[PDB]
Amino acid sequence: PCCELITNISIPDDKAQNALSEIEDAISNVLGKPVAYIMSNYDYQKNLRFSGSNEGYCFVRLTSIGGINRSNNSSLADKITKILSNHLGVKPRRVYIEFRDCSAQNFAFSGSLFG
Amino acid sequence: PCCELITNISIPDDKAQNALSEIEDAISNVLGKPVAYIMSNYDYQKNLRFSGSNEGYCFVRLTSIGGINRSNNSSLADKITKILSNHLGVKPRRVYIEFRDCSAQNFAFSGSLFGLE
Amino acid sequence: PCCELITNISIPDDKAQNALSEIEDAISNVLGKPVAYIMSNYDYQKNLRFSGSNEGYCFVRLTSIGGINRSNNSSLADKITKILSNHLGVKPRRVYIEFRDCSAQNFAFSGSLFG
């Protein structure tokens, strides 16, 4: 799975990595997908806006081959939002999360398709 | 909705904010979605290329829970492209826009999924 | 087509664009699409993580209106991974590629829908 965090909140690299690691743990726990396949990123975007302002805000896009369903999505939305509020100080009402279900045939690793 | 602008065109932060605000207004007008629900971003990507060169270019990805259809897409393609050319100086022929639909069950706000039930 | 490269490997702009040019060539060949239609990007993301570490890694998202299929995906997965290993020094096993199909109705160019 892939976890893209896009935020106008700035924290040092170790603390950014710490937050990603906790999100990775939640993804591992809820989806049951192996660490080997988990990607995460903290993309600092100074011009990011939500609700017509540049106030602190986070958007997460989570892409997964399966595991995208009401139960998992609700669990991860709760967990990920809490992690972000804790480590980045973002208001829960300034956190959006998108869940994307993708097909195995549309992914490649080390130059070959999963199939 | 989420509106991700990716461009190799450098403009001052205040001007980037102004352009994003105008795009937000167009999105609200066409899709009927309140600004309160709109995310937008100006992602300066200096090495972004189109048609084999690093010449001025904009790519926009617009994601919305519904409202993705021929009439709305056409209207927003026209409105957004005009805003970009005006504010950024990009040539319309170097503006790409992608439209993405999302189900409410696959989108969360304040730690909870959108939709009922 | 659009090819978004996201990587925690930093290289100078001239070298970044060279890698992109080679990727563009490969895309043009495999998908039978002229360079005129190809967008590419090199997005340096220093905090990007894969498999639980911040070690050198490349993620590629390739979006096309059609041309997303086993043969094309397989061929491009092979070609793009080789390019990235050659040009960026990344290990093939830390190259992850996502292929996306987009409808022509959901893409616009020059202010008008495709096309």
mmCIF file of N, CA and C in Angstrom, chain A residues 6 43 45-54 57 59 61 68-70 73-74 77-78 81 92-100, chain B residues 1-2 4 13 16-17 20-21 24 35-43 63 100-102 105-111 113-114 117:
data_model
loop_
_atom_site.group_PDB
_atom_site.id
_atom_site.type_symbol
_atom_site.label_atom_id
_atom_site.label_comp_id
_atom_site.label_asym_id
_atom_site.label_seq_id
_atom_site.Cartn_x
_atom_site.Cartn_y
_atom_site.Cartn_z
ATOM 1 N N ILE A 6 0.020 14.853 2.369
ATOM 2 C CA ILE A 6 0.305 16.171 1.778
ATOM 3 C C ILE A 6 -0.168 17.183 2.815
ATOM 4 N N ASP A 43 4.753 14.989 2.325
ATOM 5 C CA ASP A 43 5.012 15.996 1.296
ATOM 6 C C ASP A 43 4.627 17.374 1.813
ATOM 7 N N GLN A 45 3.877 20.997 1.563
ATOM 8 C CA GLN A 45 3.315 21.826 0.510
ATOM 9 C C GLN A 45 2.827 23.138 1.108
ATOM 10 N N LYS A 46 3.669 24.163 1.016
ATOM 11 C CA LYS A 46 3.442 25.424 1.725
ATOM 12 C C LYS A 46 2.186 26.177 1.284
ATOM 13 N N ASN A 47 1.770 25.973 0.034
ATOM 14 C CA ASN A 47 0.594 26.661 -0.500
ATOM 15 C C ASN A 47 -0.719 25.889 -0.382
ATOM 16 N N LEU A 48 -0.690 24.748 0.313
ATOM 17 C CA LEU A 48 -1.884 23.928 0.488
ATOM 18 C C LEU A 48 -2.983 24.711 1.218
ATOM 19 N N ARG A 49 -4.211 24.570 0.726
ATOM 20 C CA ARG A 49 -5.371 25.271 1.268
ATOM 21 C C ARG A 49 -6.490 24.288 1.500
ATOM 22 N N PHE A 50 -7.311 24.602 2.492
ATOM 23 C CA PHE A 50 -8.542 23.891 2.692
ATOM 24 C C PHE A 50 -9.544 24.848 3.300
ATOM 25 N N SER A 51 -10.793 24.714 2.862
ATOM 26 C CA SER A 51 -11.875 25.570 3.350
ATOM 27 C C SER A 51 -11.564 27.055 3.151
ATOM 28 N N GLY A 52 -10.857 27.374 2.067
ATOM 29 C CA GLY A 52 -10.607 28.765 1.695
ATOM 30 C C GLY A 52 -9.518 29.457 2.486
ATOM 31 N N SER A 53 -8.723 28.685 3.229
ATOM 32 C CA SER A 53 -7.602 29.257 3.980
ATOM 33 C C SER A 53 -6.342 28.392 3.943
ATOM 34 N N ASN A 54 -5.218 29.016 4.305
ATOM 35 C CA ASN A 54 -3.939 28.324 4.406
ATOM 36 C C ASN A 54 -3.630 27.850 5.829
ATOM 37 N N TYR A 57 -3.274 21.978 7.712
ATOM 38 C CA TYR A 57 -4.185 21.033 7.079
ATOM 39 C C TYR A 57 -3.422 19.816 6.554
ATOM 40 N N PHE A 59 -3.913 16.299 3.987
ATOM 41 C CA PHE A 59 -4.627 15.371 3.110
ATOM 42 C C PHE A 59 -3.812 14.079 2.989
ATOM 43 N N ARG A 61 -3.718 10.358 0.924
ATOM 44 C CA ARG A 61 -4.232 9.437 -0.066
ATOM 45 C C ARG A 61 -3.624 8.077 0.206
ATOM 46 N N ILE A 68 -9.842 -2.156 0.921
ATOM 47 C CA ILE A 68 -10.612 -0.909 0.863
ATOM 48 C C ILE A 68 -12.089 -1.261 1.009
ATOM 49 N N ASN A 69 -12.625 -1.017 2.203
ATOM 50 C CA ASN A 69 -14.011 -1.361 2.541
ATOM 51 C C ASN A 69 -14.457 -0.517 3.725
ATOM 52 N N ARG A 70 -15.753 -0.502 4.016
ATOM 53 C CA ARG A 70 -16.242 0.392 5.059
ATOM 54 C C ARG A 70 -15.502 0.212 6.389
ATOM 55 N N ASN A 73 -11.654 1.221 6.144
ATOM 56 C CA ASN A 73 -11.575 2.656 5.874
ATOM 57 C C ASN A 73 -11.918 3.455 7.133
ATOM 58 N N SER A 74 -12.977 3.049 7.836
ATOM 59 C CA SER A 74 -13.396 3.738 9.059
ATOM 60 C C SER A 74 -12.332 3.621 10.150
ATOM 61 N N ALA A 77 -9.300 5.738 9.034
ATOM 62 C CA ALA A 77 -9.609 7.165 9.085
ATOM 63 C C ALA A 77 -9.485 7.654 10.525
ATOM 64 N N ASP A 78 -9.975 6.846 11.462
ATOM 65 C CA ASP A 78 -9.925 7.223 12.868
ATOM 66 C C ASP A 78 -8.483 7.261 13.363
ATOM 67 N N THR A 81 -6.159 9.954 11.479
ATOM 68 C CA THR A 81 -6.490 11.326 11.890
ATOM 69 C C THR A 81 -5.932 11.654 13.284
ATOM 70 N N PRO A 92 -8.747 17.950 13.713
ATOM 71 C CA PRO A 92 -9.424 16.862 12.964
ATOM 72 C C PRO A 92 -10.280 17.358 11.796
ATOM 73 N N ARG A 93 -10.932 18.503 11.967
ATOM 74 C CA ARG A 93 -11.756 19.080 10.890
ATOM 75 C C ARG A 93 -10.920 19.737 9.783
ATOM 76 N N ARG A 94 -9.607 19.570 9.849
ATOM 77 C CA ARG A 94 -8.740 19.941 8.721
ATOM 78 C C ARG A 94 -7.882 18.747 8.309
ATOM 79 N N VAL A 95 -8.499 17.562 8.331
ATOM 80 C CA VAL A 95 -7.859 16.322 7.833
ATOM 81 C C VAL A 95 -8.830 15.628 6.893
ATOM 82 N N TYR A 96 -8.397 15.433 5.643
ATOM 83 C CA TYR A 96 -9.123 14.656 4.635
ATOM 84 C C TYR A 96 -8.336 13.394 4.355
ATOM 85 N N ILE A 97 -9.039 12.278 4.147
ATOM 86 C CA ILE A 97 -8.382 11.040 3.757
ATOM 87 C C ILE A 97 -9.139 10.400 2.591
ATOM 88 N N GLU A 98 -8.420 10.115 1.512
ATOM 89 C CA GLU A 98 -8.995 9.386 0.382
ATOM 90 C C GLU A 98 -8.451 7.962 0.356
ATOM 91 N N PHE A 99 -9.350 7.002 0.133
ATOM 92 C CA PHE A 99 -8.999 5.593 0.003
ATOM 93 C C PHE A 99 -9.177 5.150 -1.452
ATOM 94 N N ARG A 100 -8.141 4.528 -2.012
ATOM 95 C CA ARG A 100 -8.146 4.105 -3.414
ATOM 96 C C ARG A 100 -7.876 2.608 -3.512
ATOM 97 N N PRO B 1 -14.027 18.436 -2.486
ATOM 98 C CA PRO B 1 -13.150 18.142 -3.623
ATOM 99 C C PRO B 1 -11.695 18.454 -3.305
ATOM 100 N N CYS B 2 -10.791 17.907 -4.114
ATOM 101 C CA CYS B 2 -9.365 18.181 -4.001
ATOM 102 C C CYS B 2 -8.869 18.599 -5.369
ATOM 103 N N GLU B 4 -5.401 19.511 -7.161
ATOM 104 C CA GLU B 4 -3.945 19.523 -7.137
ATOM 105 C C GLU B 4 -3.413 20.105 -8.438
ATOM 106 N N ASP B 13 4.183 33.458 -3.503
ATOM 107 C CA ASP B 13 3.211 32.775 -2.647
ATOM 108 C C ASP B 13 1.841 33.454 -2.615
ATOM 109 N N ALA B 16 0.115 32.773 -5.866
ATOM 110 C CA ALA B 16 -0.323 31.380 -5.896
ATOM 111 C C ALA B 16 -1.638 31.218 -5.108
ATOM 112 N N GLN B 17 -1.696 31.825 -3.922
ATOM 113 C CA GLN B 17 -2.897 31.804 -3.095
ATOM 114 C C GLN B 17 -4.100 32.411 -3.826
ATOM 115 N N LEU B 20 -5.311 29.994 -6.608
ATOM 116 C CA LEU B 20 -6.023 28.883 -5.989
ATOM 117 C C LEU B 20 -7.420 29.290 -5.527
ATOM 118 N N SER B 21 -7.540 30.472 -4.925
ATOM 119 C CA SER B 21 -8.850 30.956 -4.489
ATOM 120 C C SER B 21 -9.852 31.047 -5.662
ATOM 121 N N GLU B 24 -10.894 27.565 -6.682
ATOM 122 C CA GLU B 24 -11.860 27.089 -5.677
ATOM 123 C C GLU B 24 -13.268 27.616 -5.977
ATOM 124 N N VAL B 35 -16.913 25.886 -0.638
ATOM 125 C CA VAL B 35 -15.469 26.089 -0.437
ATOM 126 C C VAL B 35 -14.966 25.349 0.813
ATOM 127 N N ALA B 36 -15.827 25.254 1.838
ATOM 128 C CA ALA B 36 -15.512 24.539 3.092
ATOM 129 C C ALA B 36 -15.062 23.101 2.831
ATOM 130 N N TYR B 37 -15.451 22.563 1.680
ATOM 131 C CA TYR B 37 -15.151 21.181 1.337
ATOM 132 C C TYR B 37 -14.009 21.063 0.345
ATOM 133 N N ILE B 38 -13.487 22.205 -0.097
ATOM 134 C CA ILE B 38 -12.473 22.202 -1.140
ATOM 135 C C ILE B 38 -11.048 22.292 -0.625
ATOM 136 N N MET B 39 -10.238 21.320 -1.033
ATOM 137 C CA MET B 39 -8.800 21.428 -0.871
ATOM 138 C C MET B 39 -8.200 21.858 -2.203
ATOM 139 N N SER B 40 -7.171 22.696 -2.150
ATOM 140 C CA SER B 40 -6.442 23.087 -3.353
ATOM 141 C C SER B 40 -4.960 23.248 -3.050
ATOM 142 N N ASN B 41 -4.143 23.127 -4.089
ATOM 143 C CA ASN B 41 -2.705 23.236 -3.892
ATOM 144 C C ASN B 41 -2.000 23.669 -5.150
ATOM 145 N N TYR B 42 -0.931 24.440 -4.944
ATOM 146 C CA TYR B 42 -0.025 24.897 -5.983
ATOM 147 C C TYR B 42 1.309 24.232 -5.688
ATOM 148 N N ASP B 43 1.606 23.179 -6.447
ATOM 149 C CA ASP B 43 2.815 22.380 -6.248
ATOM 150 C C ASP B 43 3.868 22.733 -7.302
ATOM 151 N N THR B 63 -10.290 15.902 -7.927
ATOM 152 C CA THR B 63 -11.008 14.772 -7.360
ATOM 153 C C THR B 63 -12.243 15.267 -6.623
ATOM 154 N N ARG B 100 -11.340 13.069 -11.484
ATOM 155 C CA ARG B 100 -11.445 11.818 -10.746
ATOM 156 C C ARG B 100 -12.669 11.830 -9.847
ATOM 157 N N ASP B 101 -13.462 10.766 -9.927
ATOM 158 C CA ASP B 101 -14.625 10.586 -9.057
ATOM 159 C C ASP B 101 -14.190 9.749 -7.855
ATOM 160 N N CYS B 102 -14.856 9.938 -6.722
ATOM 161 C CA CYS B 102 -14.589 9.137 -5.527
ATOM 162 C C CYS B 102 -15.911 8.858 -4.842
ATOM 163 N N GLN B 105 -17.937 6.599 0.687
ATOM 164 C CA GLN B 105 -17.418 5.558 1.584
ATOM 165 C C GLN B 105 -15.896 5.461 1.547
ATOM 166 N N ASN B 106 -15.302 6.007 0.492
ATOM 167 C CA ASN B 106 -13.860 5.994 0.331
ATOM 168 C C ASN B 106 -13.225 7.342 0.640
ATOM 169 N N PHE B 107 -13.933 8.168 1.403
ATOM 170 C CA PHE B 107 -13.422 9.485 1.745
ATOM 171 C C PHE B 107 -13.804 9.855 3.163
ATOM 172 N N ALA B 108 -12.830 10.350 3.924
ATOM 173 C CA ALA B 108 -13.037 10.666 5.337
ATOM 174 C C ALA B 108 -12.685 12.111 5.652
ATOM 175 N N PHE B 109 -13.397 12.653 6.639
ATOM 176 C CA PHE B 109 -13.212 14.013 7.113
ATOM 177 C C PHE B 109 -13.355 13.969 8.628
ATOM 178 N N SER B 110 -12.449 14.644 9.345
ATOM 179 C CA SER B 110 -12.489 14.661 10.818
ATOM 180 C C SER B 110 -12.565 13.242 11.420
ATOM 181 N N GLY B 111 -11.877 12.300 10.781
ATOM 182 C CA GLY B 111 -11.742 10.945 11.318
ATOM 183 C C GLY B 111 -12.903 10.009 11.028
ATOM 184 N N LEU B 113 -15.858 8.554 7.903
ATOM 185 C CA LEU B 113 -16.242 8.460 6.495
ATOM 186 C C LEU B 113 -17.429 9.367 6.184
ATOM 187 N N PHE B 114 -17.429 9.938 4.981
ATOM 188 C CA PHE B 114 -18.618 10.622 4.450
ATOM 189 C C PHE B 114 -19.720 9.577 4.111
ATOM 190 N N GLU B 117 -24.084 5.266 6.304
ATOM 191 C CA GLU B 117 -24.697 4.007 6.680
ATOM 192 C C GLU B 117 -24.185 2.864 5.818
#
